[PDB]
């Protein structure tokens, strides 16, 4: 029956496009659910702490900080009616000190006489 295909990319530019496979992936052991010593998946911790709907996962114990002692510390959200996250800024000390210099200049120039 005449009524019944992978298109290939003729090259556009000479930019090196190459696949990425990280080393920790390529050094990885392929999973084997028959080992006594295989990697402990998340179900396993989930199973020995109460079950699927009872295991209260700590999302905090897996994120990456400069100090594991503030792994579980609460970041404040609100203070005096201001969004802490929106004032949150690296080098906030730099802008704050520039503000302080400008403000004590305004004082010594006589802005609140």
């Amino acid at each position: 029956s005449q009524s019944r295909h992978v298109a290939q990319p003729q090259a556009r530019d000479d930019v090196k496009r190459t696949p990425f496979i990280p080393e920790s992936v390529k050094n990885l052991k392929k999973y084997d659910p028959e080992d006594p010593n295989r990697r402990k998946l998340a179900r396993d911790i989930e199973a020995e702490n109460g079950g699927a709907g009872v295991f209260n996962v700590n999302l905090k114990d897996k994120y990456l900080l400069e100090d594991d002692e503030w792994k579980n510390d609460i970041m404040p959200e609100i203070l005096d009616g201001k969004n802490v996250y929106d004032f949150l800024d690296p080098e906030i000390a730099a802008k704050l000190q520039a503000l302080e210099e400008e403000e004590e200049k305004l004082e010594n120039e006589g802005f609140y006489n």
Binding site: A52, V54, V57
Partner: protein, 48 residues
């Protein structure tokens, strides 16, 4: 009973759809100064 107000709660209810999500709740505030004991009553258990 003093009144009611609004609470944001960081809900940790595993198996829920609001798990790990802030949820706004209404709550009731009951003003409770300490109560002070002034007496005892003893109850016997009778066939009536």
């Amino acid at each position: 009973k003093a009144g009611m107000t609004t609470i944001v709660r960081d809900l940790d209810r595993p198996g829920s759809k609001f798990h790990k999500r802030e949820v706004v709740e209404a709550v009731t505030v009951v003003d409770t100064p300490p109560v002070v004991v002034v007496g005892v009553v003893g109850y016997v258990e009778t066939p009536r």
